From Swiss-Prot:
GO BP annotation list: DNA-templated transcription; viral genome replication
RdRp catalytic domain segment(s): 486-672
Cofactor: Mg(2+)
Subcellular location: Virion
Short name of any one Pfam family annotated for the protein: RdRP_4
Summary of subunit composition and partner proteins: Interacts with VP3 (Potential). Interacts with VP2; this interaction activates VP1. Interacts with NSP5; this interaction is probably necessary for the formation of functional virus factories. Interacts with NSP2; this interaction is weak.
PROSITE patterns (UniProt xref): RDRP_DSRNA_REO
Record GO terms (molecular function): nucleotide binding; RNA binding; RNA-directed RNA polymerase activity
This protein's UniProt keywords: Magnesium, Nucleotide-binding, Nucleotidyltransferase, RNA-binding, RNA-directed RNA polymerase, Transferase, Viral RNA replication, Virion
Lineage of source species: Viruses, Riboviria, Orthornavirae, Duplornaviricota, Resentoviricetes
Family indicated by similarity: Belongs to the reoviridae RNA-directed RNA polymerase family.
Name by which UniProt lists this protein: RNA-directed RNA polymerase
EC numbers, comma separated: 2.7.7.48
Length: 1073
RNA sequence: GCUUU
């Protein structure tokens, strides 16, 4: 309950010249007392009288009611920041070394010197793009410093290391003043031109870095990055993190986890000797020298000290540096520069062509319905992003303009213009509009915003391809329900003194122009073989259209902005923006490794234990008939690099016997690591999310980094949430939401009152508040209704429906109309109306919670019923599993040591149910977990009608509606839906093995009847409760269940009527991946 | 205001 106490200290610190705590209660008499108290406080404040007596008088309200919010009457003028800053601004300002970056605009020159005029100005290269200000970030850091000013021992040292660093930020900012933001949290030319261009973004990165510094090492690291970052805006992250790829090969393996036949982690006590040829050491030294030539001193030395022994025990520092480098900010170049960088492929093309054929051979020969109705499938899938151009769209009687894909498809159909048979050109006559992708450390990459003809022509085929990948192990990212641990396990498995692993970064090759000829040609040749496999008109056309998109792309042209002009240049490289992007890139990366591996063997003989492609990297484990020597590693590596070299591929190819390093993960000393470089105070782009969503996303981000090994102080994160979640009532009246409002599992949830522990209402006030928030979950949008009522819109819904189903529509039909009514939310105006409505409703709700006929069941209600029927009891679980993920905080790690871990994702969509599979066999429709959940619970006759309504044949529909499987699906769908409502796949829980025998013993549940739904929920509720206690207490408890038989029947009815909850916290997990 | 997968 410390967030509420913390918020007051912050408000009191921020404003000094009143605060009005607003409470509420589920009890009537208590609430009146709350109402009376709020009134007296306002009146006393409106008379400069002390509220001390009132607090004593309404002691009962403070003691038992629930704090709902805090009123802030501050008559200042959003200043204080300028005044506050000077005391910390005593150090010497930093001076940008305008000689470090190649592209001139990447140097921290004075804004004016880059944009001499207000019309030449652009924040496109420094925009933090986040709904929180620099001024607020400074206030948050200062507030923290004041609080930990009188600390002692080690806590003081943390304050001292931080105070130093903040001085650099302060001193530098003062020399120019604090950049004032506009209503849209953007920094304009007038504020900007006096000050260094990158001043604001750099301040955000430094503040974020310093507020994450605890040890002396963090402080040394933060200081170097902060000082270097101010001048270097293009190679510091790459220079700092580059040595890591060499390092993983160095550390020896002394016992590691592997993957067994059951596809699960299992400890192996083996030893693998790290074998490194002398050349690798020179390469590492060159990397270290480069860091040194760039000003870096402390960071290179740490790697150097580490290099003497190379102990996995002192490897955490190396990992820490790798995670840290990302927090320097994103490299935001100019579209043109990002764009500009861009005989022996016979084997490579053939593999790409062959792989394409295998993935579709079976679907095509049979005459798969999805291939036949591909166009219908493309339409249902269609997003609401960009089609490319801003079109004038007339809806009903409203002439509005949008660039949205969904909008363009409806308008085009309503005017015979909808023509997917014709796949538009993307050459000189019709230049491809451009999208961008910004990442830390790496160079900016471009993205094709192709017209919807392209998505539709490609959506069905890609889906078939993904399915082939789903059951193919080479495709690490798509295989089964697998998570990163299984991939980690697979590399370790075959490691020994007679095998070496070969990892390779091929991010550069994908964007290579050398790559595009063999790529498109390989896919097309494959498409032709597939076409000569059937005579189906639907299959050939869908198949043919896919062939056409590859052909149009072969010679594409792009629209690159060059100031305020749009130069058109002939782009001859494979960029992304296609539906087949990830799958195709995966097929190509795998083909490339196979091609290199085949070429190398002509020389040396080895065995291919495993080959893998995962995103932008690819790797393989080879086995030799003899023991691996340093000389052998060098020979295999030189030959591999040369083979890559002959193909004209600029790639990083390394060889080792113990580790690997790829963009998503890295294995050092038999242990698994994940870069923790998600930036907090700077974003990649500007979306359409709100401050509240942004606050939830930041918290989510804080949690992922903390699990990954980088921890930003929670008090700082809490302070940021208080600023972001606040709402202005006027210019001197600001409202701050309480801890209960923020964390309770509702539609307005932003974070968990306790990290890694999700709570659910177990008190009446919490229930009362939870019900009230839902009451105002979905808000109306006039603009949305208009278009929802327009012809062009209704016809589109109708047209899609008449093409999909045969018999009758409504469970399916109501859904199609909504799905479409939603894709209108991408359209700002509609989104803006919704936010304004939410704010007014929220302001009133915080002021005095309303009523609600409830009558709506949720997950929290089901849990609340079960709680009272369990008897706790101290228990003991010994730690039995060695740590394989070193960075995990201690409380999370302990749960893994005691109950173990998992290498899969729990089915939470219902796809593995027979009914969902049956629908897939005959329909192109895809029901959600929620729809399946309502449908499965329908009367036997209704289910038969729904299946038929979707084109499912009668013998099949009839056979299922009775069978053993239908009864089984019922349990399976609910089980899938419930897991979905409990975030069992997100955050910290995704790690834990919920079917641990050790966990299982702690649950003592006596069967008093036998009714699946109830048995599954009671065990799950118990597992979560036991685990949460372990997460918060470090010890365990055993749970006993004495749930009545009469009670179970009541509960079972309750279970089939659970409503899902939508909230920023929920969106944030979805947002992560 | 722009912002594919």
């Amino acid at each position: 309950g410390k967030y509420n106490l913390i918020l007051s200290e912050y408000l009191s610190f921020i404003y000094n010249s009143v605060q009005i705590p607003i409470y509420y209660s589920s009890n009537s008499e208590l609430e009146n007392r709350c109402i009376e108290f709020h009134s007296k406080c306002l009146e006393n404040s409106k008379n400069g009288l002390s509220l001390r007596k009132l607090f004593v008088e309404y002691n009962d309200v403070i003691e038992n009611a629930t704090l709902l919010s805090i009123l802030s009457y501050s008559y200042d003028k959003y200043n204080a920041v300028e005044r506050k800053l000077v005391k910390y601004a005593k150090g010497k300002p930093l001076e940008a070394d305008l000689t470090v970056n190649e592209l001139d605009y990447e140097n921290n020159k004075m804004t004016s010197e880059l944009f001499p005029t207000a019309e030449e100005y652009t924040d496109s290269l420094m925009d933090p793009a986040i709904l929180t200000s620099l001024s607020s970030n400074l206030n948050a850091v200062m507030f923290w410093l004041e609080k930990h000013e009188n600390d002692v021992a080690e806590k003081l040292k943390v304050y001292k290391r931080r105070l130093d660093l903040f001085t650099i930020v302060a001193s530098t900012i003062n020399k120019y003043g604090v950049p004032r933001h506009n209503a849209k949290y953007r920094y304009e030319y007038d504020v900007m031109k006096d000050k260094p261009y990158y001043l604001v973004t750099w301040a955000n990165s430094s503040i974020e870095m310093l507020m994450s510094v605890f040890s002396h090492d963090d402080y040394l690291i933060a200081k170097e990055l902060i000082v270097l970052s101010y001048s270097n805006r293009s190679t510091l992250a790459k220079l700092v993190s580059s040595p890591m790829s060499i390092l993983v090969a160095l550390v020896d393996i002394n016992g590691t986890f592997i993957t067994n036949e059951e596809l699960e982690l299992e400890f192996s006590n083996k030893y693998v000797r790290a074998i490194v040829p002398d050349q690798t050491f020179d390469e590492l030294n060159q990397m270290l020298d480069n860091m040194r030539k760039a000003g870096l001193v402390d960071i290179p030395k740490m790697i150097q000290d580490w290099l003497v022994d190379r102990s996995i025990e002192k490897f955490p520092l190396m990992a820490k540096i790798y995670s840290w480098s990302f927090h320097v900010g994103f490299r935001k170049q100019k579209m043109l520069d990002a764009a500009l960088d861009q005989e022996m492929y016979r084997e490579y093309t053939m593999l790409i062509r062959d792989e394409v054929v295998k993935m579709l051979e079976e679907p095509v020969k049979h005459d798969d319905h999805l291939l036949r109705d591909s166009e219908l499938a493309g339409l249902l899938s269609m997003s609401s992003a960009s089609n490319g151009e801003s079109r004038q769209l007339k809806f009903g009687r409203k002439t509005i303009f949008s660039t949205k894909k969904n909008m363009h498809v409806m308008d085009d159909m309503a005017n015979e213009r909808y023509t997917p048979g014709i796949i538009p050109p993307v050459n000189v006559d019709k230049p491809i509009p451009l999208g961008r992708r910004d990442v830390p450390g790496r160079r900016t990459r471009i993205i094709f915003i192709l017209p919807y003809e392209y998505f539709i022509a490609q959506h069905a085929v890609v889906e078939k391809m993904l399915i082939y990948a789903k059951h193919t192990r080479e495709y690490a990212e798509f295989y089964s329900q697998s998570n990163q641990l299984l991939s980690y396990g697979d590399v370790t498995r075959f490691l020994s003194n007679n095998t070496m692993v070969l990892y390779t970064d091929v991010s550069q090759w994908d964007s290579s122009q050398h790559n595009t000829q063999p790529f498109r040609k390989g896919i097309i040749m494959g498409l032709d073989i597939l076409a000569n496999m059937t005579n189906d008109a639907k299959v050939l056309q869908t198949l043919n259209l896919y062939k056409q998109t590859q052909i149009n792309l072969m010679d594409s042209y792009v629209q690159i902005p060059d100031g305020n002009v749009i130069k058109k240049i002939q782009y001859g490289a494979v960029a992304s923006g296609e539906k087949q992007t990830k799958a195709a890139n995966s097929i190509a990366n795998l083909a490339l490794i196979k091609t290199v591996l085949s070429r190398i063997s002509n020389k040396h003989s080895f065995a291919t234990k495993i080959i893998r492609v995962d995103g932008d990297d690819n790797y393989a484990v080879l086995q030799f008939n003899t023991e691996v020597t340093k000389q052998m590693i060098q020979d295999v590596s030189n030959d591999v690099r040369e083979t890559y070299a002959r193909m004209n591929a600029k790639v990083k190819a390394l060889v080792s016997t113990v580790g690997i390093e790829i963009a998503k993960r890295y294995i050092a000393g038999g242990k698994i690591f994940f870069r923790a470089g998600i930036n907090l105070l700077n974003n990649e782009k500007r979306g359409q999310s709100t401050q509240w969503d942004q606050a939830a996303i930041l918290y989510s981000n804080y949690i992922v980094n903390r699990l990954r090994g980088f921890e930003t102080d929670r008090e700082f994160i809490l302070t940021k949430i208080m600023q972001m979640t606040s709402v202005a009532i006027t210019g001197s009246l600001r409202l701050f939401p309480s801890e209960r409002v923020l964390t309770t599992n509702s539609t307005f949830k932003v974070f968990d009152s306790e990290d890694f522990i999700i709570e659910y209402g177990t008190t009446v006030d919490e229930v009362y508040i939870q019900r009230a928030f839902m009451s105002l979950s979905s808000q109306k949008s006039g603009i949305a209704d208009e278009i929802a009522a327009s012809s062009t819109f209704k016809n589109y819904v109708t047209r899609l429906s008449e093409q999909l189903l045969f018999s009758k529509n409504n469970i399916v039909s109501r859904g199609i109309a909504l799905t479409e009514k939603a894709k209108l939310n991408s359209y700002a105006p509609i989104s803006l109306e919704k936010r304004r409505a939410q704010i007014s409703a929220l302001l009133t709700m915080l002021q005095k919670p309303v009523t609600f006929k409830s009558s709506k069941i949720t997950i929290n209600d089901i849990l609340r019923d079960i709680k009272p029927f369990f008897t706790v009891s101290d228990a003991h679980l010994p730690i039995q599993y060695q740590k394989f993920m070193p960075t995990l905080p201690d409380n999370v790690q302990y749960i893994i040591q005691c109950i173990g871990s998992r290498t899969y994702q729990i089915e939470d969509d219902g796809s593995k149910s027979a009914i969902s599979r049956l629908i897939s066999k005959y329909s192109v429709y895809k029901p959600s977990i929620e729809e399946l959940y309502k449908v499965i619970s329908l009367h036997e006759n209704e289910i038969q009608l729904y299946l038929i309504s979707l084109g499912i044949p009668k013998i099949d529909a009839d056979t299922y509606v009775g069978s053993k499987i239908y009864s089984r699906d019922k349990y399976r769908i609910l089980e899938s839906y419930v897991y979905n409502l409990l975030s069992i796949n997100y955050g910290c829980y995704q790690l834990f093995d919920f079917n641990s025998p050790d966990l299982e013993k702690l649950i003592r549940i006596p069967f008093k009847g036998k009714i699946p739904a109830v048995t599954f929920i009671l065990h799950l509720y118990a597992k979560l409760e036991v685990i949460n206690y372990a997460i918060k207490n470090g010890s365990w408890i055993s749970l006993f269940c004495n749930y009545p038989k009469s009670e179970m029947i009541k509960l079972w009815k309750k279970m089939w009527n659970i409503t899902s909850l939508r909230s920023p916290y929920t969106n944030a997990n979805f947002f992560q991946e």
